[PDB]
Amino acid sequence: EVKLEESGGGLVQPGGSMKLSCVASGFIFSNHWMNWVRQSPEKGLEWVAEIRSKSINSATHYAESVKGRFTISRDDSKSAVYLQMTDLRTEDTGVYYCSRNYYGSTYDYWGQGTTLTVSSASTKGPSVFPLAPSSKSTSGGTAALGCLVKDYFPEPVTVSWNSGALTSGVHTFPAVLQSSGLYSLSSVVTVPSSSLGTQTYICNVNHKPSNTKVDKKVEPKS
Amino acid sequence: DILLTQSPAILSVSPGERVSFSCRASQFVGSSIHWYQQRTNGSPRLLIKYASESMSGIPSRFSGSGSGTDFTLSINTVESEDIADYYCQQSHSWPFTFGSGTNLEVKRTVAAPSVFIFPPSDEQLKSGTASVVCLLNNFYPREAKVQWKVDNALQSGNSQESVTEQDSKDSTYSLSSTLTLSKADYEKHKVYACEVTHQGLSSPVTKSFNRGE
Numbered sequence: 001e002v003k004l005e006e007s008g009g010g011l012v013q014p015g016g017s018m019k020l021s022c023v024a025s026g027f028i029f030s031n032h033w034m035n036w037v038r039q040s041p042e043k044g045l046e047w048v049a050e051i052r053s054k055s056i057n058s059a060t061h062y063a064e065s066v067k068g069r070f071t072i073s074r075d076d077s078k079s080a081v082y083l084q085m086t087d088l089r090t091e092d093t094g095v096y097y098c099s100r101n102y103y104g105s106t107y108d109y110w111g112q113g114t115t116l117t118v119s120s121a122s123t124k125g126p127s128v129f130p131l132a133p134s135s136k137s138t139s140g141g142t143a144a145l146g147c148l149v150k151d152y153f154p155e156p157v158t159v160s161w162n163s164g165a166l167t168s169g170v171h172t173f174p175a176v177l178q179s180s181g182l183y184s185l186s187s188v189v190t191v192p193s194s195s196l197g198t199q200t201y202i203c204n205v206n207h208k209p210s211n212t213k214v215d216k217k218v219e220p221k222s
Numbered sequence: 223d224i225l226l227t228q229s230p231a232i233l234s235v236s237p238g239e240r241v242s243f244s245c246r247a248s249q250f251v252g253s254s255i256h257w258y259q260q261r262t263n264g265s266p267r268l269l270i271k272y273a274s275e276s277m278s279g280i281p282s283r284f285s286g287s288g289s290g291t292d293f294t295l296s297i298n299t300v301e302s303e304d305i306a307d308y309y310c311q312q313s314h315s316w317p318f319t320f321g322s323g324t325n326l327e328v329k330r331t332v333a334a335p336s337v338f339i340f341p342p343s344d345e346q347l348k349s350g351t352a353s354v355v356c357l358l359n360n361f362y363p364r365e366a367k368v369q370w371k372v373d374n375a376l377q378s379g380n381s382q383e384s385v386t387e388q389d390s391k392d393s394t395y396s397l398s399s400t401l402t403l404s405k406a407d408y409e410k411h412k413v414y415a416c417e418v419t420h421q422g423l424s425s426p427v428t429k430s431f432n433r434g435e
């Protein structure tokens with residue numbers, strides 16, 4: 001199985017620098033051309049940079065919008081491709097995908113993306129509060145519970161339930177920017193009302209930019 | 223550079239029907255058009271290479287055709303699993319470019335939301351703020367109205383909504399509405415109520431609690 005795994009995203013001030021990494025497995029890395037492709041609401045999917053094989057001088061190519069600011073490199077001994085970004089702009093904000101292109105044709109494998117935010121605001125880790133079920137959160141045989149993940153910056157946060165064992169019925173809402181400039185979101189799940197007080201429900205919140213890793217047990221109230 | 227135009231940008235089809243996505247190139251690209259599917263929170267997945275060649279493991283209901291400048295991705299029978307954004311990409315010449323994407327919505331029968339209200343946690347109240355959350359779960363169509371009433375006084379300017387993308391398993395939406403007050407203002411009132419109207423509800427649904435019970 002081919003896997004591509006990016007890392008290094010986060011928050012940086014305008015004009016700043018940041019290096020993204022991607023580690024590949026499942027193909028002969030040194031033979032293939034590694035790419036970064038970014039995605040934003042405004043520009044959609046956008047090819048950023050490519051580095052080809054060492055056999056053809058590890059040749060690099062850049063989109064015109066990043067040329068002179070970004071440098072793509074590879075370490076074949078680590079099966080790694082890197083994107084060193086400098087002089088970053090607000091409009092460089094977006095999700096950055098590691099991707100293989102098959103010798104100038106399809107992007108036939110993609111990573112999961114790593115998020116870059118270019119902004120002058122500061123990192124802030126969230127507070128996590130339970131959305132506690134009762135009877136006004138019980139619709140017959142179904143109850144709802146959740147976690148409120150409030151006042152953080154930048155995007156993203158990830159929320160899992162019971163360390164990933166619970167995925168059915170989960171809704172993690174898009175984050176909303178509050179007037180304070182901080183994000184907030186809720187993650188909810190619907191469960192059998194009979195399971196309240198007999199099954200444990202824990203939301204696992206991770207906000208990497210603040211090194212926040214919180215597990216919140218959500219219990220019915222008093 | 224070659225511009226790929228995907229129009230319409232939004233398609234809505236009933237389950238079981240055929241749908242076609244359009245990708246038009248501003249210059250000749252031969253057959254070098256590739257199609258990708260990107261589900262919500264997911265990565266692009268290559269479906270069709272070179273206009274018509276479906277990748278291994280792609281369901282047989284996906285096909286592609288076209289050459290020159292006019293290309294079509296087709297899904298013969300549409301299931302809710304096909305809810306996604308669909309992108310074309312050319313590799314006829316450098317730099318490679320992508321279309322802006324077309325979103326697929328899959329219609330379904332009307333589904334009224336299940337409604338739930340959540341008081342603010344004791345934990346958050348110690349921090350001087352109260353968030354009250356109203357959840358509308360698994361409804362269709364997307365249009366819904368949520369109103370906050372505090373001792374029957376209609377609230378304005380102190381709530382925000384968030385809606386999920388359409389669910390690829392049941393074609394529904396879910397919505398959260400969060401009312402934010404200072405603790406001082408929260409403790410000045412008793413009845414907190416979320417009132418919901420939706421095409422599937424024969425009369426508006428109110429979920430409420432009394433502060434401290």
Ligand SMILES: NC(=O)c1ccc[n+]([C@@H]2O[C@H](COP(=O)([O-])OP(=O)(O)OC[C@H]3O[C@@H](n4cnc5c(N)ncnc54)[C@H](O)[C@@H]3O)[C@@H](O)[C@H]2O)c1
Pocket residue numbers: 028030031
């Ligand atoms: N001249 C060709 O190699 C050629 C010609 C036509 C078609 N193809 C197709 O291309 C596909 C893959 O070809 P391929 O050569 O890229 O890999 P491969 O899958 O054919 O690998 C075969 C073996 O060659 C060695 N190899 C390949 N690259 C190496 C490297 N950098 N360092 C050390 N050993 C290496 C490895 O031992 C590898 O297990 C195959 O499916 C083949 O059918 C290749």
